[PDB]
């Protein structure tokens, strides 16, 4: 599977029939139809003890991986019951500034979308958590092109060292707090992985406030390669799944 005409989102259902399931992601967030839920709690994002390890080009995106063998970087509160440990973050982005996000807001596409991936500690490991309807909590953050994001530049600067599929680099001592906007106001809904195997295991928490990144920062994302070293060059761009039908779901807002 991939993001080409021949292996992209329109083809995934043949290997992963859940692609046409009842709680697929991403979705369009209709801001006028989302329901303010005054009983939703503030998010608790606790990243002060986060231990970043490595950055990997996996042929679909790049992952910044964390030590998830202890409660070092956790997400709690909001719609969540219990404790979710940060395992990795990655992005989805476009070939052009007017596309790249997976979620949309009133049909608006952002230049990119950050996914901070967390798993429910009551399931013991990530592999068990993805088999559960409440196994993952993904914090989604939109990127718009404007001012540079200083907290992103360490990521941008290392991408030269992981250009091709299967390359990795040390990525210790990275603080993911530098990727957050000021506000933790959010939308939430039950959904899925946006990539095969498209498992319906995710509580989505999408922040209302986008972060700003510079044109030069997102340009560097677009110089990555989907291919391995010594293969024909395929730029890693447009690694996003389009919005899927909402079906029998309500999107809830933490704010009025
Ligand atoms: O880009 B996204 O769609 O957005 C959100 C998101 C994405 C991919 C993952 N993700 C996939 C894998 C692969 O590991 C697996 C192991 C066992 C499985 F059964 C499935 C996957 N690891 N993290 C997690 C969260
Ligand atoms: Zn993702």
From Swiss-Prot:
<keyword id="KW-0963">Cytoplasm</keyword>
<keyword id="KW-0007">Acetylation</keyword>
<dbReference type="GO" id="GO:0015670">
    <property type="term" value="P:carbon dioxide transport"/>
</dbReference>
<dbReference type="InterPro" id="IPR036398">
    <property type="entry name" value="CA_dom_sf"/>
</dbReference>
<feature type="site" description="Fine-tunes the proton-transfer properties of H-64; involved in the binding of some activators, including histamine and L-histidine">
    <location>
        <position position="58"/>
    </location>
</feature>
<dbReference type="InterPro" id="IPR023561">
    <property type="entry name" value="Carbonic_anhydrase_a-class"/>
</dbReference>
<dbReference type="GO" id="GO:0004089">
    <property type="term" value="F:carbonate dehydratase activity"/>
</dbReference>
<feature type="site" description="Fine-tunes the proton-transfer properties of H-64; involved in the binding of some activators, including histamine and L-histidine">
    <location>
        <position position="63"/>
    </location>
</feature>
<feature type="binding site">
    <location>
        <position position="92"/>
    </location>
    <ligand>
        <name>Zn(2+)</name>
    </ligand>
</feature>
<dbReference type="InterPro" id="IPR001148">
    <property type="entry name" value="CA_dom"/>
</dbReference>
<feature type="site" description="Fine-tunes the proton-transfer properties of H-64">
    <location>
        <position position="3"/>
    </location>
</feature>
<keyword id="KW-1003">Cell membrane</keyword>
<dbReference type="GO" id="GO:0032849">
    <property type="term" value="P:positive regulation of cellular pH reduction"/>
</dbReference>
<dbReference type="GO" id="GO:0008270">
    <property type="term" value="F:zinc ion binding"/>
</dbReference>
<dbReference type="GO" id="GO:0005829">
    <property type="term" value="C:cytosol"/>
</dbReference>
<feature type="binding site">
    <location>
        <position position="90"/>
    </location>
    <ligand>
        <name>Zn(2+)</name>
    </ligand>
</feature>
<dbReference type="Pfam" id="PF00194">
    <property type="entry name" value="Carb_anhydrase"/>
</dbReference>
<dbReference type="GO" id="GO:0070062">
    <property type="term" value="C:extracellular exosome"/>
</dbReference>
<dbReference type="GO" id="GO:0051453">
    <property type="term" value="P:regulation of intracellular pH"/>
</dbReference>
<dbReference type="GO" id="GO:0005737">
    <property type="term" value="C:cytoplasm"/>
</dbReference>
<comment type="similarity">
    <text>Belongs to the alpha-carbonic anhydrase family.</text>
</comment>
<protein>
    <recommendedName>
        <fullName>Carbonic anhydrase 2</fullName>
        <ecNumber>4.2.1.1</ecNumber>
        <ecNumber>4.2.1.69</ecNumber>
    </recommendedName>
</protein>
<dbReference type="GO" id="GO:0038166">
    <property type="term" value="P:angiotensin-activated signaling pathway"/>
</dbReference>
<comment type="subunit">
    <text>Interacts with SLC4A4. Interaction with SLC4A7 regulates SLC4A7 transporter activity. Interacts with SLC26A6 isoform 4 (via C-terminus cytoplasmic domain).</text>
</comment>
<dbReference type="GO" id="GO:0044070">
    <property type="term" value="P:regulation of monoatomic anion transport"/>
</dbReference>
<dbReference type="GO" id="GO:0018820">
    <property type="term" value="F:cyanamide hydratase activity"/>
</dbReference>
<keyword id="KW-0987">Osteopetrosis</keyword>
<feature type="site" description="Involved in the binding of some activators, including histamine and L-histidine">
    <location>
        <position position="88"/>
    </location>
</feature>
<feature type="domain" description="Alpha-carbonic anhydrase">
    <location>
        <begin position="1"/>
        <end position="255"/>
    </location>
</feature>
<dbReference type="GO" id="GO:0032230">
    <property type="term" value="P:positive regulation of synaptic transmission, GABAergic"/>
</dbReference>
<dbReference type="GO" id="GO:0070050">
    <property type="term" value="P:neuron cellular homeostasis"/>
</dbReference>
<keyword id="KW-0479">Metal-binding</keyword>
<feature type="modified residue" description="Phosphoserine">
    <location>
        <position position="161"/>
    </location>
</feature>
<dbReference type="GO" id="GO:0045177">
    <property type="term" value="C:apical part of cell"/>
</dbReference>
<feature type="binding site">
    <location>
        <position position="115"/>
    </location>
    <ligand>
        <name>Zn(2+)</name>
    </ligand>
</feature>
<dbReference type="GO" id="GO:0002009">
    <property type="term" value="P:morphogenesis of an epithelium"/>
</dbReference>
<feature type="active site" description="Proton donor/acceptor">
    <location>
        <position position="60"/>
    </location>
</feature>
<dbReference type="InterPro" id="IPR018338">
    <property type="entry name" value="Carbonic_anhydrase_a-class_CS"/>
</dbReference>
<dbReference type="GO" id="GO:2001150">
    <property type="term" value="P:positive regulation of dipeptide transmembrane transport"/>
</dbReference>
<keyword id="KW-0456">Lyase</keyword>
<keyword id="KW-0225">Disease variant</keyword>
<dbReference type="GO" id="GO:0046903">
    <property type="term" value="P:secretion"/>
</dbReference>
């Amino acid at each position: 599977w991939g993001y080409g005409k021949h292996n992209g989102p329109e083809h995934w259902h043949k290997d992963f029939p859940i692609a046409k399931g009842e709680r697929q992601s991403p979705v369009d967030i209709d801001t006028h139809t989302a329901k303010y839920d005054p009983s939703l709690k503030p998010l608790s994002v606790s990243y002060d003890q986060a231990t970043s390890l490595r950055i990997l080009n996996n042929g679909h995106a790049f992952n910044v991986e964390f030590d998830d063998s202890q409660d070092k970087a956790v997400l709690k509160g909001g719609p969540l019951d219990g404790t979710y440990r940060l395992i990795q973050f990655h992005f989805h982005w476009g070939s052009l500034d007017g596309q790249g996000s997976e979620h949309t807001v009133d049909k608006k596409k952002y230049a990119a979308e950050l996914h901070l991936v967390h798993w429910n500690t009551k399931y013991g490991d990530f592999g068990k958590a993805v088999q559960q309807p409440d196994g993952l909590a993904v914090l989604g953050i939109f990127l718009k092109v404007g001012s540079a994001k200083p907290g992103l530049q360490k990521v941008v600067d290392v991408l030269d060292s992981i250009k091709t599929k299967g390359k990795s680099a040390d990525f210790t001592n990275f603080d993911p707090r530098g990727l957050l906007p000021e506000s933790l106001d959010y939308w939430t809904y039950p959904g899925s992985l946006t990539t095969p195997p498209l498992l319906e295991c995710v509580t989505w928490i999408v922040l209302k406030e986008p972060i700003s990144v510079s044109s030069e920062q997102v340009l560097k994302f677009r110089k990555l390669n989907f291919n391995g070293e010594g293969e024909p060059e395929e730029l890693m761009v447009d690694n996003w799944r389009p919005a899927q039908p909402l079906k029998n779901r309500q999107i809830k807002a933490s704010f009025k």
